[PDB]
Design a protein around this ligand. Structure first.
Ligand SMILES: *P(=O)(O)OCC(C)(C)[C@H](O)C(=O)NCCC(=O)NCCS
Ligand SMILES: *P(=O)(O)OCC(C)(C)[C@H](O)C(=O)NCCC(=O)NCCS
Ligand SMILES: *C(=O)CCCCCCCCC
Ligand SMILES: *C(=O)CCCCCCCCC
Lengths: 80, 412, 412, 80
C-alpha cells in the first residue's frame, strides 16, 4: 500500500500546514514544529487533536508527548 | 487632579467597519438590524439582530490566530487597531514604543464574552466527551482575553483590567481606566467594549425573559427607543475603543485631542435582578454624581435607551429628575434604533458616538419615532439628526443587577 | 490618600464553611481535594477537584431563589453574609443602614461565573429548541450578578463593580474597591471573589490544554506548589469576602480592624495568552509597585503558586528578582495544595488567609513538599505551619491574558 | 371526570407552591400571583414553563400574558 501511505502523508502535511498557517512545502519529514513551523504548546495539542479527527484515530498521550518533528507524527500514523 | 483626554477612537458595528462610516450612517438614521443569518433562527421567536455582515476577521489577525479568538475579541482587535493607529502612538512595527509600554495599560469591557464558544464546546463535551473540547476554547471565550489579545498585539504592559458589569460594562471600562490614570497607575489606557452574542443560547436567553422585540417582519422598525410601540430590545454586536491619555503627556506627544474627560458616576439600584429601580433612582444618582463632578453644561445625552418598556420609561423619569424638569433636559437620543443595543459594548460604542457628535456639531437622532409615548415626553431628536454645537456630552449605561455607570466628556 | 482598613472577613472553600474552620484546617495542612462527585467524571482524564461537599444553598437564600443563582453566587452570598455580619455593620434587619447605603458599594470578582448554567442551557437549546432555555439562565450566570444578588441582599447602593481578569480577578476586585474609596467614590466596599466551575466543560477545557494535574489516585497529593513532582493545578471552588472601610469611618462606628490596606500593583505581560512572561517579568513589576507603594517590611507572601511547572517557576524567579536574592525573599507559601486553585476566587480567599495568618502569627505551609525543585529554591514553609509574627503580608495573583495583580496589607 | 379534575388541579397547585415557595394553603383559585403569592414577571414566565413541562402542554404567549389569578391557569389546563 505504498500509494496509500503516500496519500496519508499528503493529508497529514495538509492538516499541519492549515493549523499552523504554513505552506505544505515547509512541512518536511525533518521539521520541528516550534523552530521550523512557528508552533507553540497550544498549537501542538490542537494540531494533534485535528489529526485524530481528520484520521479518526487516537494518539495516546505518551507518543504525543515525544512528538518533535513532522516525521514523528508521520511514522506514528504510518504504524497506525 | 490629573487631566485626561481622548486621543484616538475606533468602532465597528452593524452600520460600519470604522467610526467614520458608522457614525455617518448612524447620524443619517440608517438601520443595521437585519434577519439573523449567523445561525439558523427559523424555529426561534426572535429572528432579528444587529449582525455585522461585512466583517472579515482575516484582515485584523493572522488566520492561524483567528480560531483562537471568540468573535467579540475579533471585533475588539478591529476597533482597537483603528483607535491605536488613530492615536499616533504606534511605532514603525505597529507597537507601543518600548519606553512608553509599561505606563500604557488596557481596560476592557464585555457582558459574557465568547458565549457561542462556550455553547459550542458545551455541546461537543455532551455529545462526544471531553476529548472533543477544543483546546483553544477557554482563551477564546474569557472576557478578559480582550485585554490579553490587545495588550499582546500592541505591546502595552500597564494595568490590564476588565469589567463585566452586564450592559454597563462598556462604560465601567472607561471609568476604571480613568480611575487608574487619576491615581497615577498609568499615563495612557486603551479602553474597549466588545460584544458578540448572536447565537442560539444568547437569543434564547433573552427571549425566555421576554426582553427582545419580536417585530420579526420589519427588522429596521423593531428598535425604537422611547416610542409608544416599542416592545423589547434588538440585540446588536460590535466594539468601540478609545485611547485615554494624561493631558501633559498628550500635548508633549503632539496628540490630537478629541475631548477631555469631565466626570463620571457609578451606583447600584439594590432593587431587582433585571428591572430598574422605581423612578430610575439608581440612574438618577449616577447621573447626579457625574454632573456634579463635571461641572459643565451638557448639550447632548446619549441615553442607554434599549427600547424595552421599563428602561426607556425609567431613564426618562430619572433624566427629568436630574436636570430638574422636561425643558431642562438637554437633547437626548439613543442610537440603539440604528445599531441595536450592543450590551457590554454599548457604553464604549456610545462614548465614541457622543464624542463624534460633539466634534461635528451633529446630534444623531432616535429613529422609528412614530407614536409619542405620553410617559416618554423628552426631546429625543426624533427621526433626523440635529445640527447643534455642544460643549459636553453625557452617556448612560445600566445593566442587570442594577449596576449603573455614567460618563461626561467635554470639548477640548 | 484616604486610609483603608479591613473590618470584616468571610470565606468558604473545600476545607470549611467559614473562615475560622477553614483557616484552621489550612494551617494544619489538611487538604480538601476529593474525587469529583458533583458530576459523573468517570470518563474524564481528570477526576479530582476541590469540591465543597457540605454547602447547602437553602441556608443562605430562600428555596424559591436558589434556582435563580449559579453556585458561584450561592457561595458568594455565603461568604459575604459571614463578612457583613462579622463587620457588625448590619442593622436590626440584616441590611446596611439606609443613611450609609448610598456610600457602600460592592466589587465582585470571578473568571467565568455560572459556567455550569451556560453549559446546561446550551444543551437544552441544542436538544429541545430555544423554548427550553430557562428564564433564570442569564441572571444566574453573569459574573456581576455576584454584586447583583449581594447588593439586593444587603441593600448597598454604592458603586457596583465587577472584575473578570481570569485567575487574578479576586485580587483585582480588591484593588478596584481600594481605587474607589481612594477617589472618594465610596466610604466602604464589600469585596468578594467567587468561583465554581467543577462541571464537564470546565474540567474538559483545562484538561484539553494539559493545565490540570492527572494524579487521580491520590487527590491529597495532587496539588504541590513548587514541588519537583508538580504536574498541573487542581481546580477548586469557593469564595472569599472582605469589607473595606475608610479609616476614620471605621473608628467612628467602633469597627473591628483586621488590617490596613498598604499597597497594590497591576501590570500586563503583553507576552502570551496562557504562559507566563519570561522571568515573571510582568509579575515582577506588579510586586515592585505594590512594595514601593506600601513602604513596609513584608514578613509573609501568599504566592499564586498554582502547582504548574511554568507558573511556580516563573513566580519564584520574579520573587527573588524583586526582593534581591533568594535569601532576601520573605517566607512564602501557596495554599493551593490545601484547597486547590480557585481561579477567580483565589485572590479573595488568599487575602483572607494572609490577613488571618498575620492576625494569628501562624503562617500556613505549602503542603506536599516531597522533592525539592532546584529551580524553585525559596523557603516555602514546607508541610508544617510556622509560628512567626509578621507586620505585613503580600498576596500575588496572575491570570490568562498575562494580567497581574498584587496587594499588600499591614498590621493595624 | 370529577376525580380526574381534582387530580389535575392538585398537580397544578403543587407545581405553583414549589415554584413560588408558597404553601398550597395560599394558592386559592382567586389568588393573585403578584399580590397574593409574592411572584414577579420572571417568576411567572418560569412557572408557566414548568407547568407546560409538568403537563406536556404548550400555552401560546399571547394568552399567557392574560393571567392574573391561579384560576386563569387552572381553567386553561381544564380546556386542555
Ligand atoms: P419583569 O416585569 O421584571 O420583566 C423582566 C424583564 C426582563 C422585562 C426586566 O424587568 C427588564 O425589563 N429588563 C431590562 C431592563 C433594561 O432595560 N436593561 C438594560 C439592558 S436590556
Ligand atoms: P504551553 O507550553 O504554553 O502550555 C500551556 C499551559 C497550559 C501549560 C500554560 O502555559 C500554563 O500552565 N501557564 C501558566 C500557569 C499559570 O499561571 N496558571 C494559573 C492560571 S491557569
Ligand atoms: C444588560 O445589563 C442585560 C443583559 C446582560 C448583558 C450580557 C450579555 C449576555 C448574554 C447571555
Ligand atoms: C486563570 O488565569 C486561568 C483562566 C481562568 C478562567 C476562568 C475559569 C473558567 C474556565 C473553565
Amino acid at each position: 500500500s505504498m500509494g496509500y501511505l503516500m496519500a496519508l502523508f499528503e493529508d497529514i502535511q495538509a492538516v499541519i500546514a492549515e493549523q499552523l498557517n504554513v505552506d505544505a512545502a515547509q512541512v518536511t519529514p525533518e521539521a520541528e514544529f516550534v523552530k521550523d513551523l512557528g508552533a507553540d504548546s497550544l498549537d501542538v495539542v490542537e494540531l494533534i487533536m485535528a489529526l485524530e479527527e481528520k484520521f479518526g484515530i487516537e494518539i495516546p498521550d505518551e507518543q504525543a508527548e515525544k512528538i518533535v518533528n513532522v516525521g514523528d507524527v508521520v511514522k506514528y500514523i504510518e504504524d497506525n | 487632579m490629573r487631566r485626561i483626554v481622548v486621543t484616538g477612537m475606533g468602532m465597528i458595528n452593524s452600520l460600519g467597519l470604522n467610526k467614520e462610516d458608522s457614525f455617518l450612517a448612524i447620524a443619517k438614521g440608517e438601520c443595521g438590524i437585519k434577519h439573523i443569518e449567523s445561525f439558523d433562527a427559523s424555529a426561534f421567536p426572535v429572528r432579528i439582530a444587529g449582525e455585522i455582515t461585512d466583517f472579515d476577521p482575516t484582515e485584523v489577525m493572522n488566520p492561524k490566530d483567528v480560531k483562537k479568538a471568540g468573535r467579540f475579541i475579533q471585533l475588539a482587535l478591529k476597533a482597537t487597531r483603528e483607535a491605536m493607529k488613530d492615536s499616533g502612538i504606534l511605532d514603525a512595527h505597529n507597537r507601543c514604543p518600548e519606553e512608553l509600554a509599561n505606563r500604557m495599560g488596557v481596560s476592557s469591557g464585555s457582558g459574557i464574552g465568547g458565549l457561542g464558544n462556550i455553547e459550542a464546546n458545551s455541546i461537543f463535551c455532551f455529545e462526544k466527551g471531553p476529548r472533543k473540547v477544543n483546546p483553544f476554547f477557554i482563551t477564546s471565550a474569557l472576557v478578559n482575553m480582550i485585554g490579553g489579545f490587545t495588550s499582546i498585539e500592541f505591546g502595552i504592559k500597564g494595568p490590564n483590567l476588565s469589567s463585566v458589569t452586564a450592559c454597563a460594562a462598556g462604560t465601567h471600562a472607561i471609568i476604571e481606566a480613568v480611575k487608574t490614570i487619576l491615581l497615577n497607575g498609568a499615563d495612557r489606557m486603551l479602553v474597549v467594549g466588545a460584544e458578540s452574542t448572536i447565537c442560539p443560547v444568547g437569543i434564547g436567553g433573552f427571549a425566555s425573559i421576554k426582553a427582545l422585540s419580536t417585530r420579526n417582519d420589519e427588522p429596521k422598525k423593531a428598535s425604537r427607543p422611547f416610542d409608544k410601540d416599542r416592545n423589547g430590545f434588538v440585540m446588536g454586536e460590535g466594539a468601540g475603543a478609545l485611547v485615554l491619555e494624561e493631558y501633559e503627556s498628550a500635548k508633549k506627544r503632539g496628540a490630537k485631542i478629541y475631548a477631555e474627560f469631565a466626570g463620571y458616576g457609578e451606583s447600584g439600584d439594590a432593587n431587582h435582578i433585571t428591572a430598574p429601580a422605581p423612578e430610575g433612582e439608581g440612574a438618577f444618582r449616577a447621573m447626579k454624581m457625574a454632573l456634579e463632578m463635571a461641572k459643565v453644561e451638557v448639550g447632548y445625552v446619549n441615553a442607554h435607551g434599549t427600547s424595552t418598556h421599563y428602561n426607556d420609561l425609567y431613564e426618562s423619569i430619572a433624566l427629568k429628575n436630574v436636570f430638574g424638569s422636561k425643558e431642562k433636559v438637554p437633547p437626548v437620543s439613543s442610537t440603539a434604533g440604528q445599531i441595536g443595543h450592543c450590551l457590554g459594548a454599548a457604553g464604549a460604542l456610545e462614548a465614541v458616538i457622543s464624542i463624534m457628535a460633539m466634534n461635528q456639531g451633529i446630534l444623531p437622532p432616535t429613529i422609528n419615532q412614530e407614536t409619542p409615548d405620553p410617559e416618554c415626553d423628552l426631546d429625543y431628536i426624533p427621526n433626523a439628526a440635529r445640527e447643534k454645537q455642544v460643549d459636553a456630552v453625557m452617556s448612560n449605561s445600566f445593566g442587570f443587577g442594577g449596576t449603573n455607570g455614567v460618563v461626561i466628556f467635554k470639548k477640548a
